[PDB]
């Protein structure tokens, strides 16, 4: 793969990167950069936490938004030179951004890609949209939930609807936190050295969503139907019960981590209600879920149930949970970038040299 396009999706927690045309990211590494805590000069990814002990670790991406441009540069460098092993200047590069990304950010990013990395061509696409594309639709409402943030994004004919976007500062990073908390409140000594890592694995291995939380609690109270076990490496085995479904419940009841916000079913419903009454039909029947925090077993049907209850009785609801939705966004991009009707949509270095960083903002 040379003279081919690159796809780079920068999550709050995870970076996904690869080549357009590929069915999956060749590179998935933690979105973190570490510099020597005292006085080589920088580390990124797995190696940065491997040596967390002698570095100050930082996260360029907070809430899905880029906040540290220097550190973000180191991430992109590590992406091209160290992960993909490619030269940016001979690959058009597609990049992804959060809904509601400020214009100054998009331009700052376009500006770096050109001046600093000297890529021949580039494009910025909104993450949620790519997810939708990945499913083969151009109309619907996406629920993207990654490590740092959660959005509801209504989309109509390839264009998102900014007035109707719902943002929720609750994602997997805080769900892992919640689980770590509870687990400990039951005598399980957990810290960050290496525990934080285990708590996350338990999360993705054992947690699931209850179709009926009140009802599911009573089950785990009257039998051991729902107990499951996890042997730590130390050796100490531990058992989990209602904790398996109480942790993800936080997505529907944020008041579990004490957030007086509303749950993803409500924000999904509110988001649709915020749209043209004539396209609601299309939206209700096209809930596409993306992100790693949507991977919980049972979340699709819980959502289906919750929404059927909020909406009109006559409307047909539908939830689409691609088994690949952990990587939907990236896949969405992988597809786009490879299509031929898209090849005219690239921003060329030439175009940028004439107009300026502002040559990356279109309406319609």
């Amino acid at each position: 793969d040379e003279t081919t396009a690159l796809v780079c999706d920068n999550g709050s927690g995870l970076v996904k990167a690869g080549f357009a045309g590929d069915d999956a990211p060749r590179a998935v590494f933690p979105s973190i950069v570490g510099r020597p805590r005292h006085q080589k000069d920088s580390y990124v990814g797995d190696e940065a936490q491997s040596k967390r002990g002698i570095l100050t670790l930082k996260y360029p991406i907070e809430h899905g938004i880029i906040t540290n441009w220097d550190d973000m540069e180191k991430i992109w460098h590590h992406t091209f030179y160290n992960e993909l092993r490619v030269a940016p200047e001979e690959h058009p590069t597609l990049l992804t951004e959060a809904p509601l990304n400020p214009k100054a950010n998009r331009e700052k990013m376009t500006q770096i890609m050109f001046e600093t990395f000297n890529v021949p061509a580039m494009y910025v696409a909104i993450q949620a949209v790519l997810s939708l594309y990945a499913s083969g639709r151009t109309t619907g409402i996406v629920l993207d939930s990654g490590d740092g943030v959660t959005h509801n994004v209504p989309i109509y004919e390839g264009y998102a609807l900014p007035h109707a976007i719902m943002r929720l500062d609750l994602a997997g990073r805080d769900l892992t936190d919640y689980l770590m908390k509870i687990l400990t409140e039951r005598g399980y000594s957990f810290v960050t050295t290496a525990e934080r890592e285990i708590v996350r694995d338990i999360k993705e291995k054992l947690c699931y969503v209850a179709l009926d939380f009140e009802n599911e609690m009573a089950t785990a109270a009257s039998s051991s139907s729902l107990e499951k076990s996890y042997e730590l490496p130390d050796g100490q085995v531990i058992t989990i019960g209602n904790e398996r479904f109480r942790c993800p419940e936080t997505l529907f009841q944020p008041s579990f981590i004490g957030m007086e916000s509303a749950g993803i079913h409500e924000t999904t419903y509110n988001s649709i209600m915020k749209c043209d009454i004539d396209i609601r039909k299309d939206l209700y029947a096209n809930n596409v879920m993306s992100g790693g925090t949507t991977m919980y077993p049972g979340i699709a049907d819980r959502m289906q149930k919750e929404i059927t209850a909020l909406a009109p009785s006559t409307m047909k609801i539908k939830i689409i949970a691609p088994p690949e939705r952990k990587y939907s966004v990236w896949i969405g991009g992988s597809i786009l970038a490879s299509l031929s009707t898209f090849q005219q949509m690239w921003i060329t270095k030439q175009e940028y040299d004439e107009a300026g960083p502002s040559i990356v903002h279109r309406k319609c």
Binding site: D22, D23, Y133, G158, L339, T341, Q344
Partner: peptide, 22 residues
């Protein structure tokens, strides 16, 4: 894009596509 070019991109997307397997 904003022209008689956005509709074909759209149509192409829905069409689908294969992706080199790794």
């Amino acid at each position: 894009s904003c022209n008689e070019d956005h509709s074909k991109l759209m149509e192409q997307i829905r069409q689908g596509v294969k992706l080199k397997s790794a």
